[PDB]
Homo-oligomer: A and B are copies of this chain.
């Protein structure tokens, strides 16, 4: 699929919220533990993502995630569209979080350790972190 398509959803763990972005073409992920599910936090994450990758469109599993004017303003400013109307990651990620959870005091540390492990793991046969960079560089 197109190199500009992203998936953005939130999951819950230990009473906290984890924001999870997936680059659909590569399987690369970025993730953050956020205070709670707020439009303001979603908007921040979108702006950071867009300043780093060529983000064209973002899909989500919960469309109400994007209804706040803060989110719509971020998407407007960054030139991002949404699709009005991947699972192997959110499973794998929570699996990897589980494996490393006791090795870190704060969930946020375990989450970033798990993202690192996911993006560097070679499946075949590049890693997801290698694929995204190769896909983006190629499209240039």
Contacts and interface: CB of A to CB of B under 8 A. Distances in A.
Interface of A: 30, 32, 43-44, 47-48, 50-54, 74, 77-78, 108-109, 112-113, 115-116, 119-120, 126, 129-130, 133-134, 136-138, 140
B140 A47 contact: no
Given A30-B52, A52-B129, A47 B134 contact: no
Contacts of A77: 113
Contact of A119 (B30, B52, B113): B52
A133 B126 contact: no
B47 A109 contact: yes
A112 B49 CA distance: 9
B30 A112 contact: no
A140 B136 contact: no
A51 B109 contact: no
Given A30-B52, A134-B137, A44 B108 contact: yes
Given A30-B51, A51-B119, A133-B140, 20 more contacts: A30-B48, A30-B52, A32-B48, A43-B109, A44-B112, A47-B109, A47-B112, A47-B113, A48-B115, A51-B112, A51-B129, A52-B129, A53-B129, A54-B129, A77-B113, A78-B116, A130-B140, A133-B136, A134-B137, A137-B137
